Amino acid sequence: TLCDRYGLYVVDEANIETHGMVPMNRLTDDPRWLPAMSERVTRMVQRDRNHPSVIIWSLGNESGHGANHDALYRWIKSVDPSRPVQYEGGGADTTATDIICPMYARVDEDQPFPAVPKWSIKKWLSLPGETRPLILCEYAHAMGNSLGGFAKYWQAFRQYPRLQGGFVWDWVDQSLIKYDENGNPWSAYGGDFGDTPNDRQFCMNGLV
Amino acid sequence: SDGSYLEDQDMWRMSGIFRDVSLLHKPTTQISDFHVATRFNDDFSRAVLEAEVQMCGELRDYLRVTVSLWQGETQVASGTAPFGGEIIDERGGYADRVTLRLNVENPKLWSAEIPNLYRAVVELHTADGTLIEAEACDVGFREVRIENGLLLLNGKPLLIRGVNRHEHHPLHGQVMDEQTMVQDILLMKQNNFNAVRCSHYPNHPLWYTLCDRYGLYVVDEANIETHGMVPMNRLTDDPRWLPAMSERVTRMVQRDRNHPSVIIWSLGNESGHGANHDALYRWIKSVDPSRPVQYEGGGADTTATDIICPMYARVDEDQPFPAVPKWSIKKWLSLPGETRPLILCEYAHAMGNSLGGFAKYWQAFRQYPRLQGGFVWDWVDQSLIKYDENGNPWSAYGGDFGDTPNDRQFCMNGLV
């Protein structure tokens, strides 16, 4: 409602992420989990499809590429043809996305990982056969003293028509407040609650 | 002559009988044309050589054509037939043509790395075995196609290490001899070049034979350039010049279509974009579907080219001219709708102390699949020799012969 009234474009995303599985698509390639995944996608679309600010649907995040993703991509295109669908898993340019949507691809430097390479964004555009627009779903990881080389993304976005921008990672630090002996507040991060294992200060990636 | 309007190439303007003169004797019944084409299975393990032969003179029932294929001294394949093609339309077929098909198993493929050649002999003879006349040419088995935005040879993507070359000699002007041609080919291969662009007209016929034998890819180019017109397409958009332009394109293709080294046809150079170029692009695709056609005029990516072929586009910097912008080559590839390969028909102008930033092109060629290389401008300086008072020779350039107006030292752009 607030994004409709003030004016922001929204990507609305299904609650599906299976990052810690080995391999990452162990559940999203299994037909026994197709029921559980379909409730997460179909109920989001039935709730939010009347909002003008929602311009793109997303199938979730970091769950590899499985046949369950293709089935659900096609379900949304059929019930709601008025918005594109994006999905980054399985190398950011599978048959389950309308937009190439890499995370942390660099402007000029290739990172050739096996099965899921991250090409430079200028090169990705022109691979044999490729016609889709490119919008980075995560770029410029703002952890601590960061955003070096930000100008280099914005030079490329303005020069190439099919580079249509991206979403910085991310808005606000996820720190929590703890109290010392004198009752003075302090900012705490992973591991400060006796939680173990933990990922320490990786929870603070915000611009604010 | 009015033909001078179509020959405004950047070079010395000279005149005369500057190539060979010869007499040829043929019998009255004679081979008047022949074409050779090669087709492959998916992995290049089986080929069909198809030969079309046409005759002139009086057709008789006893006339026969034999085509044989030789590898060294070993005969590899042979075929024989009487005249009479298959039915073409409601009125019949060509009584004065025949098509032989020869199967070849595990052919050795031609490329610039390994220039394997066969020899095809065509014999017109009587049914009882008397020879009337024989003709022959060198055959290279290779396939050139564009697939999914890449130029492929024998199924693999090419990287063109090319140069532009003019026919120029400092003492003899535009007269080419064999010794000069061989010297240029050895120096090119010794400096890691694999391709040559005939800038900007068909070459002496011996050039294509040497490129077949030593191994260079050739772009063969029609003698059409109207650079000094305003606007540049004033003649190539006029239908009254369509006759003159079509003779320059159709006669080049009828002369050179049997050479394995010729892999790409070009419609000429710097003549804007006119409806005459579209008509002639389509003529070549129809008579010779086995080679791509390229043309740079009118902004390097018109409907008259299979390859985007800019001249002097930069690696990273755009040059946005009105109507005919030169995009950076990395950006050109990804413009909305664009799917073709990109090969620069001229880059890295080598005038005087030059080629700064050459490494930057080669970094981009190796990183982007659809950037498949380019032709440097150019091979040899076009200087001429003059003599001083003591008879000592010196190298001269535009304006040193009292020629005016002239373009001074712009005639020297060579790597040698």
Ligand SMILES: OC[C@H]1O[C@@H](SCCc2ccccc2)[C@H](O)[C@@H](O)[C@H]1O
């Ligand atoms: O803010 C951390 C980022 O971590 C990387 S995993 C690679 C880095 C990593 C892996 C394991 C523990 C800590 C960091 C994700 O791809 C991003 O979406 C984001 O969550």
Ligand SMILES: OC[C@H]1O[C@@H](SCCc2ccccc2)[C@H](O)[C@@H](O)[C@H]1O
């Ligand atoms: O070697 C000179 C080059 O000149 C430029 S025109 C622009 C430069 C120019 C124009 C008029 C006179 C002198 C140079 C051509 O496009 C090239 O193909 C090549 O011929």
Ligand SMILES: [Mg+2]
């Ligand atoms: Mg010119």
